[PDB]
Amino acid sequence: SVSKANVPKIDVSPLFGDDQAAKMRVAQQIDAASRDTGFFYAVNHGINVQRLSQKTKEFHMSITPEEKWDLAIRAYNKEHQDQVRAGYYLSIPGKKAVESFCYLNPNFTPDHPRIQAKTPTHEVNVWPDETKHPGFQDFAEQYYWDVFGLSSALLKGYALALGKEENFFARHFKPDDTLASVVLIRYPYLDPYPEAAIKTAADGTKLSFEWHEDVSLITVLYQSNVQNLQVETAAGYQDIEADDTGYLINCGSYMAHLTNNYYKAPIHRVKWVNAERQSLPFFVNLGYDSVIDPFDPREPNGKSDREPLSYGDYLQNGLVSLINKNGQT
Ligand SMILES: CC(C)[C@@H](NC(=O)[C@H](CS)NC(=O)CCC[C@H](N)C(=O)O)C(=O)O
Ligand SMILES: [Fe+2]
Numbered sequence: 001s002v003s004k005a006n007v008p009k010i011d012v013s014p015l016f017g018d019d020q021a022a023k024m025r026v027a028q029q030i031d032a033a034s035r036d037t038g039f040f041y042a043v044n045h046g047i048n049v050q051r052l053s054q055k056t057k058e059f060h061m062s063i064t065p066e067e068k069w070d071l072a073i074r075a076y077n078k079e080h081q082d083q084v085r086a087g088y089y090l091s092i093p094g095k096k097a098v099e100s101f102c103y104l105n106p107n108f109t110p111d112h113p114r115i116q117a118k119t120p121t122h123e124v125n126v127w128p129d130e131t132k133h134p135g136f137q138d139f140a141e142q143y144y145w146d147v148f149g150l151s152s153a154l155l156k157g158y159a160l161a162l163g164k165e166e167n168f169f170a171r172h173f174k175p176d177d178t179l180a181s182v183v184l185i186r187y188p189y190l191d192p193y194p195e196a197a198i199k200t201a202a203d204g205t206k207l208s209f210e211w212h213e214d215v216s217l218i219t220v221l222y223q224s225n226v227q228n229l230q231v232e233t234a235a236g237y238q239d240i241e242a243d244d245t246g247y248l249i250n251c252g253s254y255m256a257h258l259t260n261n262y263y264k265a266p267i268h269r270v271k272w273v274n275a276e277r278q279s280l281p282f283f284v285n286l287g288y289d290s291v292i293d294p295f296d297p298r299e300p301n302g303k304s305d306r307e308p309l310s311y312g313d314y315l316q317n318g319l320v321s322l323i324n325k326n327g328q329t
Pocket of ligand 2: 213268
């Protein structure tokens, strides 16, 4: 018998306003969720998720093998040595079902100083041909800034929840240098479904992606309406109900580090379900040099003995570790 996780729906609209007490009431709800299962749905967020889903589906269903090779990351195309993060992550017919397209900050151009310095984790996005995918790049870049704006507001909520001024996290989340990424993931319907793409957990559950903590400050996720996620609790895994009108929010391991595990990064996994669906995360990453001094909200003085960790070092190590543990996606 698998139980269902308590995942509250939080109206985040006050975080865009100037009613300070209303913002505190949202923060209290974020705090409560972050100390319980670690997940909540953000509702009344203002993002046109219908258009997001439609445009993503048009892209996934119309891109051809030729185009996928041309956009592929270095794991799938040895010619693209500069594409570790950004580009197309191919499926492998009969072996690997999932495929995805990842893009980074649109402001990362050949002229950007971090690109000119060849700083790790910064890359210039690759895009399909405008004539084959009209409006796709325009849509995707605007979506990046829309979800950036929602994420900025959420970070104000997290700061207030922890007793800090509302710009405590957001001041490090800047359009000019954020390492945040969008991933447009297609999980396909397949018949027969390749057995190599199904993992069996210790408890017998069939999975598409094994247990992990997120490499992020927070993760801001839109998924279509097919139940798939489970969160670990002390009493075992619990199902997270789907909601295709809201964003599912959780903390990543950078938040756990800087709060001395007061807000844990929830361990979660993806159940195998044979259904055509979309999983569209935005990983809220800071800048390469961003450092937040850790603190412990449990102590009156907030003192922590944990070392400050540069976000760039955290991200570089975290991305590689996730591939080594859970496989190349
Ligand atoms: C659980 C979902 C978020 C999704 N999984 C995922 O997106 C998983 C686990 S959080 N994430 C990753 O592989 C990290 C992608 C990082 C990205 N290439 C980048 O360079 O920034 C899924 O549906 O499998
Ligand atoms: Fe995750």
